[PDB]
Design an enzyme around this catalytic site. Structure first.
Site, PDB file in Angstrom:
ATOM      1  N   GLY A  29     -34.776  53.325  34.780  1.00 12.10           N
ATOM      2  CA  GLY A  29     -35.740  53.412  33.705  1.00 12.10           C
ATOM      3  C   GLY A  29     -35.491  52.413  32.598  1.00 12.10           C
ATOM      4  O   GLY A  29     -35.049  51.288  32.853  1.00 12.10           O
ATOM      5  N   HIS A  47     -29.592  47.108  40.466  1.00 13.70           N
ATOM      6  CA  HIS A  47     -30.878  46.461  40.221  1.00 13.70           C
ATOM      7  C   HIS A  47     -30.901  45.774  38.856  1.00 13.70           C
ATOM      8  O   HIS A  47     -31.410  44.655  38.723  1.00 13.70           O
ATOM      9  CB  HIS A  47     -31.985  47.514  40.340  1.00 13.70           C
ATOM     10  CG  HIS A  47     -33.376  46.969  40.243  1.00 13.70           C
ATOM     11  ND1 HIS A  47     -34.253  47.349  39.249  1.00 13.70           N
ATOM     12  CD2 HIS A  47     -34.055  46.102  41.033  1.00 13.70           C
ATOM     13  CE1 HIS A  47     -35.408  46.731  39.422  1.00 13.70           C
ATOM     14  NE2 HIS A  47     -35.315  45.968  40.497  1.00 13.70           N
ATOM     15  N   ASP A  89     -36.041  43.630  43.789  1.00 10.78           N
ATOM     16  CA  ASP A  89     -36.899  44.809  43.851  1.00 10.78           C
ATOM     17  C   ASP A  89     -36.875  45.446  45.236  1.00 10.78           C
ATOM     18  O   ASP A  89     -36.798  46.677  45.354  1.00 10.78           O
ATOM     19  CB  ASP A  89     -38.326  44.437  43.445  1.00 10.78           C
ATOM     20  CG  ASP A  89     -38.448  44.119  41.955  1.00 10.78           C
ATOM     21  OD1 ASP A  89     -37.478  44.370  41.203  1.00 10.78           O
ATOM     22  OD2 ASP A  89     -39.515  43.626  41.533  1.00 10.78           O
TER      23      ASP A  89
END
Ligand SMILES: O=C(/C=C/c1ccc(O)c(O)c1)O[C@@H](C(=O)O)[C@@H](OC(=O)/C=C/c1ccc(O)c(O)c1)C(=O)O
Lengths: 121, 121
Positions: A29, A47, A89
């Protein structure tokens, strides 16, 4: 951009990416990294370290092309930044799918002050 | 930064900020702006227009100091950008508290295709 990343997460995990990963643990997030709470959270940690290596493109807004072939994410870019962004991604979407088995809803909406300082990437 | 914004929202509304506002309507969250669905959504619309006119600082990453005095957010910066940033965040936190009365859970995880284009800021 988030549009491609969200679609990848949907295609791999089958889950609404905002509901499941928009606010999970210390790393899935908004804003920054923290010591990961579990394997799912660690996917988002990697990530975010992946995004830091990018130079020359904006991971939040910059669009790129990819296709869904043989139920596989296939990046469709020659540009080095867009190609690396797309592989960042793709990797988190795969990692989230692989660790769905330990996903724990109790880590949804986890608060920042309850996260320890993350290590350098 | 989103850290300070989250703390203000918690102080004003008492609500988990990610839970109630991380993905609400067309404007609360990380998907740009859209025609607001209700008053709570309109708070986030105004907030994002406020961020758009900031020059000299990064609204997502730049941390700043504020104080909670007599249960009021008191911005404690005099650098023009951080001051304005702090005021943007204070205003949305207050606005969200003021519109809890019409907050509707049905707008949580509202899908972008249902959003209409936002008016110019
Ligand atoms: O700054 C914060 C919170 C920031 C924040 C929150 C949500 C968000 O969504 C966000 O984005 C940011 O908290 C810090 C602060 O008050 O200065 C600080 O709080 C405390 O120490 C509280 C200790 C305590 C409390 C109750 C007790 O009963 C008790 O015994 C002890 C800390 O936790 O580190």
């Amino acid at each position: 951009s988030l549009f491609e990343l969200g679609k990848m997460i949907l295609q791999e995990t089958g889950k609404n990416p905002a509901k499941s990963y928009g606010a999970y643990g210390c790393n899935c997030g908004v804003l920054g990294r923290g010591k990961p709470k579990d394997a799912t959270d660690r996917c988002c940690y990697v990530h975010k370290c992946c995004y830091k290596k990018l130079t020359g493109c904006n991971p939040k807004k910059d669009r790129y092309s990819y296709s869904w072939k043989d139920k596989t994410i296939v990046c469709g870019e020659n540009n080095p930044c867009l190609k690396e962004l797309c592989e960042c991604d793709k990797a988190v979407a795969i990692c989230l799918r692989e660790n769905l088995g330990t996903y724990n809803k109790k880590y949804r909406y986890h608060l920042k002050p309850f996260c320890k300082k993350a290590d350098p990437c």
